[PDB]
From a paper:
Instead, PP2A depends on its B subunit to recognize and bind to specific sequence motifs that are often distal from the phosphosite but help to position the phosphosite in the active site of the catalytic C subunit of the PP2A heterotrimer. We have previously shown that Eya3 recruits PP2A–B55α to dephosphorylate pT58 on Myc, increasing Myc stability and enhancing primary tumor growth of triple-negative breast cancer (TNBC).
We determined the cryo-EM structure of the PP2A–B55 + Eya3 complex to an overall resolution of 3.7 Å. The structure of PP2A–B55 + Eya3 shows the typical PP2A architecture with its horseshoe-shaped structural A subunit interacting with the more globular regulatory B subunit (which is a WD domain made of a seven-blade β-propeller) and catalytic C subunit. The middle portion of the C-terminal tail (residues 298–303) interacts extensively with residues on β3D of blade 3 in B55, and the end of the C-terminal tail (residues 304–309) extends to the interface between the A and B55 subunits and interacts with both subunits through hydrogen bonds and van der Waals interactions. Despite the presence of full-length Eya3 in the complex, only the density for a stretch of extended peptide is visible in the structure. We did not observe any significant density for the full-length Eya3 even at low contour level, in the 2D classes or unsharpened map, after local refinement, or 3D classification with a mask around the peptide. This is likely because the entire NTD (residues 1–250) that contains the peptide interacting with B55 is unstructured. Using the information from our previous biochemical studies that a peptide segment between residues 53 and 90 in Eya3 binds to B55 (46) as well as residues Y77Eya3 and H79Eya3 are critical for Eya3 and PP2A–B55 interaction, we can model residues 73 to 79 into this stretch of density. In particular, residue H79Eya3 forms pi–pi or pi–cation stacking with H179B55 and a hydrogen bond with D197B55. Furthermore, Y77Eya3 forms a hydrogen bond with the main chain carbonyl of L225B55, and K75Eya3 forms another hydrogen bond with Y337B55.
Author numbering:
A (entry chain A): 10 to 589
B (entry chain B): 9 to 447
C (entry chain C): 1 to 309
D (entry chain D): 65 to 86
The structure:
Amino acid sequence: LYPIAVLIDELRNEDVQLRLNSIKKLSTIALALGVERTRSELLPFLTDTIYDEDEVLLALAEQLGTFTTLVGGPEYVHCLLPPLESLATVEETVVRDKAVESLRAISHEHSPSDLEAHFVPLVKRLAGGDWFTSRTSACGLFSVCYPRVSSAVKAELRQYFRNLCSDDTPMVRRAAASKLGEFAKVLELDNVKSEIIPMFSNLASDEQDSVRLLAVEACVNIAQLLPQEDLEALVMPTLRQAAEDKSWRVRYMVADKFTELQKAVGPEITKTDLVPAFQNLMKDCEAEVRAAASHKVKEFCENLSADCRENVIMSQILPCIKELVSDANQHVKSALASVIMGLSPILGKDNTIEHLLPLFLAQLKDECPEVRLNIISNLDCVNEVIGIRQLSQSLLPAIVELAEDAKWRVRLAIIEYMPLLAGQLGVEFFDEKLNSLCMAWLVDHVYAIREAATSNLKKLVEKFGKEWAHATIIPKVLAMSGDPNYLHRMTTLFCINVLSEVCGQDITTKHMLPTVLRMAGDPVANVRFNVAKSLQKIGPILDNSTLQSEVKPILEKLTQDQDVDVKYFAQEALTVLSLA
Amino acid sequence: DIQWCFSQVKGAVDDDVAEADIISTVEFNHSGELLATGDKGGRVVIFQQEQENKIQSHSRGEYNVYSTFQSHEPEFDYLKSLEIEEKINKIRWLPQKNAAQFLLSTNDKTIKLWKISERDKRPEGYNLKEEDGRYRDPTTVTTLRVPVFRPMDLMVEASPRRIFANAHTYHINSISINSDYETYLSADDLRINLWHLEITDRSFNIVDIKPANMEELTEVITAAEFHPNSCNTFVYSSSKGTIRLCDMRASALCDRHSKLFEEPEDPSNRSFFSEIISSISDVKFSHSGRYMMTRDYLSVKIWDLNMENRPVETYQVHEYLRSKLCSLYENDCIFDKFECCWNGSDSVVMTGSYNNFFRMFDRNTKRDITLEASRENNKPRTVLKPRKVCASGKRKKDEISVDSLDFNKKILHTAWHPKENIIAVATTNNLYIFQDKVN
Amino acid sequence: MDEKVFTKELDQWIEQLNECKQLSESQVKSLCEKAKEILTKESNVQEVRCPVTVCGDVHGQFHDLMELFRIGGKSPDTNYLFMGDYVDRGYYSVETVTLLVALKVRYRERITILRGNHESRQITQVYGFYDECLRKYGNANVWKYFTDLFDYLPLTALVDGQIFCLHGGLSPSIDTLDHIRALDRLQEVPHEGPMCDLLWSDPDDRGGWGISPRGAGYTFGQDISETFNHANGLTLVSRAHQLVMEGYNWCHDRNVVTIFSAPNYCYRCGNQAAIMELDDTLKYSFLQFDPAPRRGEPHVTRRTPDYFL
Amino acid sequence: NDYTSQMYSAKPYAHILSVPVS
């Protein structure tokens, strides 16, 4: 009982953190006081406490939303309305959204009688107030309280909504345009056709554009409702007027929502009206519009009329892409190149080698490394269809020119991408041409590149197998371990560490162990305690006999060096390996 | 024609004010009740109107203080490490959202966003202590009661709600809430950003005229604005005379304007100073939406949104100083960022001047008056008398000679009640409230 | 006994600091005492043997330090030899200095940190370090701990007796390291004196002697530097504390080299940075690099943001 | 006519000019 009176005196406080972690456990205080005590005297203390911060109210809103049972259940849930209503008026948008969410949540608890008695009047008060924050918060409650009321109440609610969507501020108007779709989803179809379409058109033709750019999503959610014999009589004019808008924001929001538009309006209306609008979008005057449009190329063509797919593609879409590829804006090419590939498995090998391959080579000679990165990463689509021979005849210039430039970020990227290419292309061509690049990276100057190639060796070996490993992979690095610089020697040790656990115990014991023992005598101490670390890591795969025969005496020697770091690490090794 | 009658005075009463006593901006509310005044040093003050007590109708209430809060503290920007300042440049009132009254505020490099709210309730009682603060024994607790809210006196507060800091290289000098209660802009001397009111960690540069080699600075931005009815028309000024009018519909980056209002300079005036006396100072739109005043140093000019190469009207503020220009340059008074303000319904203009004069030209009747703000020669409910300046020696008991004006009391900032005729001229240290003579 | 738990505690501290999270005052006090009792042994001149990776000014730019660690190999695999300047306008100066001192305490042999000119109580108070301590810790105790710790830092460093490293320049009253061994380091560096010249002087392309604009130290010319170099039997002098556009710059007939390690100094000059890699054969090299892309900064992006679509 | 022989106006907006560093 004492902690209860502790917590109670933390609501009224002067520290935001103490108030926060006291308000977090309101359920405990409620269970302490009880149902009657809470409903009688607690909530009136939470209704007026609007002297607070963002996160305090943000937690209080959810906590109040979850009290549907501490107050008693579906008889007194209508006693949490004052505090949530008084939360639905604050200015911080996140608090308003949490309050609206909790209101929609607890709306599923009132009896329909209690619904029509108390909840609907709450909607009328909130959607008829003066402070436009109230109306904004009320815009999104009709969806959860519509279906379970009487007819006259339904008419009243629709009248309120139509009085909302014609407000004189822009914020109310836009926050009603948003929920237009969620509201129209539940309206009966005749009521939809009669009332929703006029408000929808009035919105879509509003004087602002921050209000027009939501009518597009409204159009998607509405067109997913009407029968096919109406999508042209009611919706399509609005859409055709949107796809030629004067403010690029609406054009963008049309582009970004193109595949859903197609799915909804159906392939007939797509093939009839969207393709010309699609081209008009792709030849836009702004950058971001072309960005979105080009980004949406593949999925668009991949859902056209199954019969006339290839015809319309080859007849209309390809010249637009042939123009796009030679653009001057970076992001446009960066977007297009990464998605263009999906056209080959649908155009077929002949049309591919005829048209696509020319601009593939035109892309692979770009100047912004991101373009080449995308077009190299996304090669599986064309490799599955036309074979990697004709492309691999010329890919090597791209990879080589990419993996030698100045800024090491792109080198790191191509090293990250190398495993995919090697696993997708073939091992013979790899060992014939590319195999020197990994060895050239292993001794790179920038440490990050060295670690990248280090992990790349493991990935490549586990991809192919240890046979090709002991064929064309380890011996050379062990030979390289005799460089004049110590960093490359430690790098060879790193490769041994990352490779031992996969290159087979026999191959390890027969090839790398003598190298480790020889490296254990390097003059500089860095290599020596790194050798200690390597032995500690590699111990498990070895045998106890090998340990006792060679490793243990080396550890005893290394525990006696002139410095202290190797001593410490060798003590650690002996300890956690039971070699003490 | 209307008459102006001294009706109040505020602030200091002496003539020995310190540095942080110089009223540096004055901006009425949207309705007209409140009236901010952010003098130097950051001490934003807020004057509420005494609402109309229905017992007295004609006497529209005088102004009383409502709150007070420091805006900006001194600072040191170790990166450049010189003198980050504590001035107040531009106050702007967001519309009515709830019982609060928000308002932006800006020193030279960081825009806050304050809030003015009211509190009239408090809790009384505890469960671990008594009201005295003397703790009871943690075992003596036997019953539990919850703190309740009991009425109290009225109280206000001003908590910094957001801070849009650290984005501008040079000095911010303009703000404008947009048209849709969601965005706004803020134009430094070479860039322009476009914030979002509820996101304090991003921006969107939208205009940049910085030459690659910083040797050739030709134009600098001096004021921006939006359109009071359009969502996509901001009209940032310049420093050589031009007033570009971009359009955020054609292309996102509005470096490609859609108009260029520019006077075709006349060789009959350019002798030694046109390039410095032809710099715009504050480009204001009009409550209608069409005209757009631009008070330069020597002449108010009313442009039009449908006539590029020429103004519709023109007025002269203190044209008798075109000879004194030379001497005025000798004490840096030739550089002085003045400001104007429209009528509530586009019928009258006004602008500050030298020696506590503030003319107000007229749109329809082309008449122009010249008042004078001074505490001594007047009393509440008196009537002001139009003064008269004289260029030559014709000084006959009703004028003030040109060689007697004190170019040290400059009425820079003014205001105008958005509906009625209660102007608020802000002198070097006071906040005169010349009310109209209601009849 | 205590050594094992202390090493584990230091490992936890380093792991936590690696994601930019500060510590508590008790931890700072314990680490400062340990650093005191460790650094009290090392003399003014310190002979650290090759291999080593020389560094330069970091000036509190933590992300640049992380980029350096990603470029020149993670500690303690690669040795390091810093040249002070962990303060003056870094965004995370306290994090940088505590990371460096923690690495020094845990790896008292691998790493060696010299003394900078800017780490003096008045200098850190003026140039934002005191402000950073106030705004992050809520008091000035940690600043005092760091300032008193700064006294124990060695003046210079030596590599095989040929490569001489110091924060700034030389002094007219100092002729060889024998006076350096005689000089006391347990005192504040004044605005005048041989130590001030050691920490504040600079080499100049022009001849003669000039006064540094910073109000302290005197700029030694080519002649004095060359006479010192051939008198002491050295090959070159490695210095820092001078911003250069191309990261590193040879000077005075390749005798004195200037090294910077804070790319894009003060976030506006937009320079480059490099670290002099030193090998066992003493074939000095350089590894230029650019500042790492960061996150969280207020972006003035010409590209449209997500709120304006 | 005027006698402040000059042909520049970088005076009022001075800090907009270099004032670059240090």
